[PDB]
Amino acid sequence: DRINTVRGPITISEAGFTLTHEHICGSSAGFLRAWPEFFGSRAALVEKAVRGLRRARAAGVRTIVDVSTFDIGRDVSLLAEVSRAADVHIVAATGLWEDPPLSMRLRSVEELTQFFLREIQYGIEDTGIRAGIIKVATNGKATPFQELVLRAAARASLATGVPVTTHTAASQRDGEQQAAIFESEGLSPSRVCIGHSDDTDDLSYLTALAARGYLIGLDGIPHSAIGLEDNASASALLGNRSWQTRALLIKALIDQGYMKQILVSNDWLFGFSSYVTNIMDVMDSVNPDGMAFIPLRVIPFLREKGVSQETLAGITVTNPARFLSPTLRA
Amino acid sequence: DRINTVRGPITISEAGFTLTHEHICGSSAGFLRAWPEFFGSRAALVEKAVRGLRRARAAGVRTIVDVSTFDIGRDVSLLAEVSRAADVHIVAATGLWEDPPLSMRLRSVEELTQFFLREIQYGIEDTGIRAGIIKVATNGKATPFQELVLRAAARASLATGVPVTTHTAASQRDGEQQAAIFESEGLSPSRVCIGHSDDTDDLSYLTALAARGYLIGLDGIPHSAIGLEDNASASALLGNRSWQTRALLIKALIDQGYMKQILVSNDWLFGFSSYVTNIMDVMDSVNPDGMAFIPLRVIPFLREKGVSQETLAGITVTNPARFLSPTLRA
Ligand SMILES: CCC1(C)CCCCC1
Ligand SMILES: CCC1(C)CCCCC1
Ligand SMILES: CC(C)OP(C)(=O)O
Ligand SMILES: CC(C)OP(C)(=O)O
Ligand SMILES: [Zn+2]
Ligand SMILES: [Zn+2]
Ligand SMILES: [Zn+2]
Ligand SMILES: [Zn+2]
């Protein structure tokens, strides 16, 4: 009956309209503390994030799930500061993404489970802030270490009821192997979001995951380099499918009977050091609405395509609450 | 005329007997803050390091150079705490070792130079503690990113006079390429230590570096898995050459006229998370003297082999002072 946020436990009804895959800052462990000038200053990043979350809140957002891990440079005191100033709930993450350091890559499945449980059950660092989701990643076939991470995430979820959310190379159908590993540990698909699933048009892949009870993360709707002329780095990151193409996958899965299993988000950030310099400025040019893109552009677009207000409320409010609510089977 | 330590500037004469390549903790950025229980506790690691540095000090050590970078999980407040409690000067490092995260790997030569200068000229994180050495690494042919690091280290040294110290795959003769890159940026060899040079017996390699004016880091003298039975992970890390074999390289370079260019150390640690679990316990079984191994075992061994007290004082006191003393040409 409670979800952990960076400001403490909230009731399910307090979560309201929830963006399930977002970032305050996409960075690396220790980087914001060691090199804050990369972002102008820590104060400049805070001010940018507060302004952005205030615009999201004015557009109807009440909660974001910051799926930044240890290795995305998650700074839960930064999330707490921004959450307080913007009056937007932030759920923090544990887990590991695609850039673990050696001190994490050399660990066993049991050691990793201990670390994920620490962040869920005790707190992140010395902050007492507890994660309300476990984030994991593959980019194609899982590395041996990534198989241990997915198993440890499953064990941590089985002990606590906290859900798992994933990064995929969606065009490589990674969710199939992620599902296989999770299920081998006994994890209910109802506790798992297969993310970056809007990066593919393959309905045979998306419905194979949805049919076995996975939540489908259509989480990068504004990610598009269409229109950016001669920017190879932005094209490699964002792809050349339109936001409309991505958004129509929401409608596709509704039309196949999966409205209760869809989670929608922007996968936006206010700082981004783990890619090319100045990527944040390019991304802000593409999508000046930032995290407000879902409510301001995607919801009206789907309404115009014949999706009901009730169905979209179920996707943006009911599904996130059912996902985030701790349980072994949702 | 001053060397920066974790407790502030010290005079050259205050450095005294100096171990030029050591670690309080060999970890990863953010790891000790996020998972202190890996080490038992932060307090247990502090107590172990203080006990070890007190034993070194009783054996005659006055200063260690902690060559832990950002990506070795350098915690300068941990170094300051241990330095104060043990009454042993600690020089901190900037630079990057072999485990940089994406937020560092995507940076340009100019950006990296800015970051290294920040840690030398302004301070590490928000601590005001300034690095007194730049640490860099290759493991065989430099990656493209490692070429940028070595160039940025050279630029940072050329601006400040702070020396550069390296990690090599010594058996792959990496110091030849490291020298080539440093010299292409205009860096004096007198400002550079080519480290882990005791990992090779190739005198053709070691004298090629020493002849052009490089300092030679014979920095892993107690690293040996001889005697450890059936421990593949310890054998891969420590090698199967004896500490005596490593120590006799000191005598070899003295006998070739390079006594002023030799730097000796243990490359010891009090915590080690970036390798297999329990490696610290295996290493402590091999070398119970820890950082005191140089003064307690190596110095007497070299005296027994006919090296003078005066020559060994020049290696352990004069050479480190000449190396660490900021200058463009030593
Ligand atoms: C029948 C699918 C539906 C019209 C349900 C109401 C929300 C919009 C989708
Ligand atoms: C001649 C080399 C030397 C005997 C000099 C004094 C110290 C030991 C080495
Ligand atoms: C910056 C990283 C976390 O972004 P992503 C694009 O994997 O969601
Ligand atoms: C733990 C790391 C820094 O050790 P090394 C063995 O490269 O000196
Ligand atoms: Zn991702
Ligand atoms: Zn993301
Ligand atoms: Zn090394
Ligand atoms: Zn070292």
Residue numbers in the entry:
A (entry chain A), B (entry chain A): 35 to 364
The authors write:
Accordingly, it has been characterized from a number of bacterial sources, including Brevundimonas diminuta (Bd; formerly Pseudomonas diminuta), Flavobacterium spp. and Agrobacterium radiobacter. The present study focuses on Bd_PTE, a dimeric metallohydrolase that has a (β/α)8 TIM-barrel fold with two Zn2+ ions embedded in the active site. Carbon dioxide reacts with the side chain of Lys169 to form a carbamate functional group within the active site, which serves as a bridging ligand to the α-Zn2+ and β-Zn2+ ions, both of which are required for full catalytic activity. The buried α-Zn2+ ion is ligated to the protein via direct interactions with His55, His57 and Asp301, and the exposed β-Zn2+ ion interacts with His201 and His230.
Thus, based on visualization of the projections of different product ligands, in C23_2, C23_4 and C23_5 the following residues accommodate the P–O–ethyl and P–O–isopropyl moieties following detachment of the leaving group: His57, Gly60, Ile106, Trp131, Asp301, Leu303, Phe306 and Ser308. The CH3 group of the CH3P moiety in these OP ligands is projected into a space defined by His230, His257, Leu271, Asp301 and Phe306, an observation consistent with the previous report using the nonhydrolysable ligand O,O-diisopropyl methylphosphonate. The isopropyl group of O-isopropyl methylphos­phonate and the ethyl group of O-ethyl methylphosphonate project in the same direction, which clearly differs from that observed for the methyl group of methylphosphonate. The short distance between the P—O O atom of the acid products and the buried α-Zn2+ in the C23_2, C23_4 and C23_5 structures, together with the similar short distances of the P—O O atoms observed for O,O-diethylphosphoric acid and O-ethyl-4-methylbenzylphosphonic acid, suggests the involvement of both Zn2+ ions in catalysis. The findings presented in this study may help to rationalize the role of the active-site metal center in PTEs. The OP products observed in the C23 crystal structures are in their ground state.
